Every structure is written in structure tokens, then in C-alpha cells.
Design a protein around this ligand. Structure first.
Ligand SMILES: *[C@@H]1O[C@H](CO)[C@@H](O[C@@H]2O[C@H](CO)[C@@H](O[C@@H]3O[C@H](CO)[C@@H](O)[C@H](O[C@@H]4O[C@H](CO[C@@H]5O[C@H](CO)[C@@H](O)[C@H](O)[C@@H]5O)[C@@H](O)[C@H](O)[C@@H]4O)[C@@H]3O)[C@H](O)[C@H]2NC(C)=O)[C@H](O)[C@H]1NC(C)=O
Ligand SMILES: *[C@@H]1O[C@H](CO)[C@@H](O[C@@H]2O[C@H](CO)[C@@H](O)[C@H](O)[C@H]2NC(C)=O)[C@H](O)[C@H]1NC(C)=O
Ligand code: NAG
Ligand code: NAG
Length: 159
């Protein structure tokens, strides 16, 4: 409940992962699961490409891996993983389930984080989202939201 889960949503309008997702027909790819403690210093365990590829469906945000694995996946382990989950297997298991739920198209609660306001469609196209509400960035006031196609009135989509 105390852990933020953020992910990316497709958009041909955004340079980087969002466009790569649009092109590959992926609607949502996990960014990370964030507890409150961040992980300064040398990791307990150094994550290997094989362990990171086990988070099936998660696309790397780095152009330099053609938006596949592992830069982003490795970064999340280094910045939020080791110091909080102590061992790689439980983390991988959790990252893979959240991504699986994302891939099923149904996240518990989708909630805008950052938009790219598309003037041509009078829509706040959502680039990143999370499981809980948060202050927005780049979302025009009173304009409708586009969550990987799905049209939603508010920033969040529940309660
Ligand atoms: C929200 O985010 C928090 C992080 O802040 C997160 O909490 C963490 O939860 C993980 C589990 O998901 C938990 O990790 C365990 O830590 C204990 C020690 O406290 C370990 O024992 C566990 O490892 C397990 O044990 C193996 C080794 O131990 C022995 O070996 C045998 C045989 O292998 C095992 O069967 C036995 O367990 C035995 O004891 C390890 O090698 C394995 O990796 C195995 O999994 C876990 O690593 C952390 O303690 C929590 N930390 C905090 C700070 O809360 C929480 O899940 C998040 N929740 C949500 C919903 O997102
Ligand atoms: C993935 O989705 C399923 C289905 O929405 C989640 O399962 C529910 O979890 C709640 C806990 O808040 C339980 O009360 C329900 O019993 C579960 N429902 C079903 C149908 O299993 C699951 O928690 C999600 N997993 C992750 C990792 O986010
Ligand atoms: C990047 O991935 C896509 C889809 O998997 C592919 O069409 C493209 O050729 C890849 N490779 C490079 C080097 O761009
Ligand atoms: C990862 O989840 C996928 C579904 O995306 C499933 O094929 C596999 O069982 C899961 N792997 C692990 C390590 O649990």
C-alpha cells in the first residue's frame, strides 16, 4: 500500500519509450515499484541480464538496448531494490506480476503522472501513470485524458 508503482503508456507523440511502445503495440510497460527508502551505495547483489529478462513484458526506457532489456530494469534494482527486498528473486517475482497485470490491460487503479497535451485532439495524452493520485506535469486544466487510447474525464480513473 505504501509502495508507488509507476509505468509508461504508449504515445507516438513522445520521443523514446512511449513511441517504441506505440510502434510495438504495447500499451503499458512498468517503470518501477518504489518504497520510501532509496538505495545509496553498492548493491547486496549485482543484477544479471538473465535475472532482469525474467520481468516479462517490461521494456527498457534506453534507446541503447532498442527499448528491450536491461538498463532501466537494472537501474530500478540498484536505486530501489536491493536495500528494500534484500534478495533478487522476491523483487523479480513482484516486478513480473505487476507487469503481467499491466499487460492484461487491467491495472488495479490507473492515475496520470505526466501528459503531453495534444492540441489537435484537445486531449491530455498520458505518458506515465501510477496506482495512486499525484501532482500532474504537462496536463492542461479541464481537458480530457487519453490513457493508451482509453478516454477518461479525470486525472485518475477510480473512487
Ligand atoms: C513494499 O516494499 C517493501 C520494501 O520496502 C517490501 O518489503 C520487503 O518484502 C520482501 C519480500 O517481498 C522481504 O524480503 C525478505 O527478507 C527476508 C529477511 O527479512 C528474507 O528471508 C527473504 O528471502 C527468502 O529467504 C531466502 C534465504 O532464506 C532461507 O533460505 C530458504 C531456502 O532458500 C528459504 O526458503 C527461507 O526463506 C530461509 O529463510 C532467500 O535466498 C530468498 O530470496 C527468499 O525469498 C526475503 O528477501 C523484505 O523483508 C521486505 N522489506 C521491507 C523493508 O519491508 C514489500 O514486499 C512491498 N509490498 C508490496 C505489496 O509491494
Ligand atoms: C494482479 O491483479 C489481481 C486481480 O486484480 C490482484 O488480485 C487481487 O488482490 C486483492 C488484494 O488487494 C485481493 O483482495 C483479491 O483477492 C485479488 N483478486 C484476485 C482475482 O486474485 C493482484 O493483487 C494483482 N497483483 C499485483 C502484483 O499487482
Ligand atoms: C528495434 O526493434 C524493432 C522491433 O522489435 C525492430 O523492427 C528494429 O529493427 C529493432 N532493431 C534496430 C536495430 O532498430
Ligand atoms: C512472469 O510472469 C509471466 C507472465 O507475464 C509468466 O509467464 C511467468 O510464470 C512469470 N515468471 C516468474 C519468474 O514468476
Amino acid at each position: 500500500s505504501e509502495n508507488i508503482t509507476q509505468w509508461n503508456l504508449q504515445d507516438n507523440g513522445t520521443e523514446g519509450i512511449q513511441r517504441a511502445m506505440f510502434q510495438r503495440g504495447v500499451n503499458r510497460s512498468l517503470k518501477g515499484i518504489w518504497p520510501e527508502k532509496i538505495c545509496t551505495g553498492v548493491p547486496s547483489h549485482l543484477a544479471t541480464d538473465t535475472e532482469l529478462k525474467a520481468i516479462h513484458g517490461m521494456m527498457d526506457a534506453s534507446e541503447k538496448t532498442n527499448y528491450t532489456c536491461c538498463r532501466l530494469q537494472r537501474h530500478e534494482w540498484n536505486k530501489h531494490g536491493w536495500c528494500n527486498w534484500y534478495n533478487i528473486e522476491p523483487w523479480i517475482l513482484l516486478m513480473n506480476k505487476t507487469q503481467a497485470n499491466l499487460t492484461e490491460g487491467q491495472p488495479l487503479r490507473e492515475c496520470a503522472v505526466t501528459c503531453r497535451y495534444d492540441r489537435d485532439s484537445d486531449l491530455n495524452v498520458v505518458t506515465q501513470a501510477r496506482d495512486s493520485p499525484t501532482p500532474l506535469t504537462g496536463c492542461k486544466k479541464g481537458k480530457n485524458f487519453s490513457f493508451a487510447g482509453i478516454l477518461v474525464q479525470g486525472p485518475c480513473n477510480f473512487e
